[PDB]
Design a protein around this ligand. Structure first.
Ligand SMILES: *[C@@H]1O[C@H](CO)[C@@H](O)[C@H](O)[C@H]1NC(C)=O
Lengths: 49, 351
């Protein structure tokens, strides 16, 4: 099963500066975000192999 | 027995009398709720709608200020977004009744705006930030613009805040009406008028209209006194509606002109500083619909008797103790009147 190496930490927006959320796991082929119950659009995700 | 006056025998015990008393309480509460429900829902609807509409206006104004900063002063972003967001957040918090100082909103807005103007527009090229913030007010760089905006927005925001508070207090008192607990003597009189006929073995006999009138005018002597203050509340709200959408929407032109005004004296300023350092339709329809309920407290005992089963003819009716051929004949209210006096003074002072 996939083991998370870099689990997302609760971010805080300061002075309207958009801060992205990090996610790193191995072994992983597909990683998606579920923000507030629903899936996040494919375009918003930025994958690194 | 302690309620049903026993003239002959009786078909009910003391526990059945307590059951009849509790059913009398529940019937009175149901009648009051049915009387007050339409007005309660009217004021709740209008409160919700006006709240959302004011929030829409504030959001649109914040969006336009951010957009006009993006378009005309890209050198001031993203700091411009910060102080605009803080300003309109404090705006909304003041509209919703929080302790926010309007003069402090405008002063913090210009205090944050001046240093980025100086560093990015006038003298291109963090620790000296406070010296610029002090120089903003000490040299009056923005002229009369801050006081103009201060009065312009304080005048509208205070009337809107008090409009919302008035709507909420109307909701509060109309909710309070149907929860008015009455005296024990009135409980016994209502039990006699509605149920004690069943203890004497009568099945369909209704109480006399005059007996209902004496009982209702007996326990609503306090509630009827609210009518003067409720009428004054309605009329003062009408006085207030006769403001804030137009003001918040012209703010962008004024801010742009203030930035131009400060840039106009940059020559002397840079050297000195370098050395030193459909709404109106809705409220109209609301007032016209609210004037239809001006008799609410005066017509309330009439409502209780006209919606309770009574013999209007006063013939072959129940008089609380026997079947006759013809009929013979504070604290919570004080708080309601106190709050009405307060809100009425607050209304009248605004307009
Ligand atoms: C938000 O900004 C956009 C872009 O200029 C604008 O078209 C829109 O009217 C604004 N909306 C509000 C709520 O201000």
């Amino acid at each position: 099963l996939p083991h998370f190496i870099e689990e997302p930490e609760d971010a805080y927006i300061i002075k309207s500066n958009p801060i992205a959320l990090r996610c790193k796991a191995r072994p992983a082929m597909q990683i998606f975000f579920k923000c507030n119950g629903e899936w996040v659009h494919q375009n918003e995700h930025v994958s690194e192999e | 027995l302690q309620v049903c006056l026993p003239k002959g025998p009786t078909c009910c015990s003391r526990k059945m009398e307590e059951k009849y008393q509790l059913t009398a309480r529940l019937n009175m509460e149901q009648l009051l709720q049915s009387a007050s429900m339409e007005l309660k829902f009217l004021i709740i609807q209008n409160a919700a709608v006006f709240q959302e509409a004011f929030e829409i206006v504030v959001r649109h104004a914040k969006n336009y200020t951010n957009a006009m900063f993006k378009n005309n002063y890209p050198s001031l972003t993203p700091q411009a977004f910060e102080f605009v967001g803080e300003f309109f957040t404090d705006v909304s918090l003041y509209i919703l009744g929080s302790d926010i100082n309007v003069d402090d909103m405008v002063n913090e807005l210009f205090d944050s705006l001046f240093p980025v103007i100086y560093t990015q527009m006038m003298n291109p090229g963090l620790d000296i930030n406070e010296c610029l913030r002090g120089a903003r007010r000490d040299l009056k760089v923005f002229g009369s613009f801050p006081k103009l905006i201060m009065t312009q927005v304080s005048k509208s925001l205070q009337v809107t805040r008090i409009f919302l508070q008035a709507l909420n207090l109307g909701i509060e008192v109309i909710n309070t009406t149907d929860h008015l607990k009455f005296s024990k003597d009135c409980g016994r009189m209502l039990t006699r008028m509605w149920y004690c006929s069943y203890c004497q073995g009568l099945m369909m006999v209704k109480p006399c209209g005059g007996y209902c009138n004496v009982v209702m005018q007996g326990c609503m002597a306090g509630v009827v006194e609210i009518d003067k203050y409720w009428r004054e509340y309605i009329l003062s709200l009408e006085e207030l509606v006769n403001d804030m959408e137009n003001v918040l929407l012209g703010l962008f032109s004024t801010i742009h002109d203030s930035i131009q005004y400060v840039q106009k004296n940059g020559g002397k300023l840079t050297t000195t500083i370098g050395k030193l350092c459909t709404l109106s339709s809705r409220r109209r329809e609301l007032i016209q619909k609210l004037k239809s309920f001006i008799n609410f407290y005066s017509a309330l005992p009439g409502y209780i008797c006209s919606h309770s089963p009574v013999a209007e003819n006063d013939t072959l009716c129940w008089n609380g103790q026997e079947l006759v051929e013809r009929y013979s004949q504070e604290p919570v209210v004080s708080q309601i009147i106190d709050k009405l006096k307060h809100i009425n003074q607050l209304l009248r002072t605004m307009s």
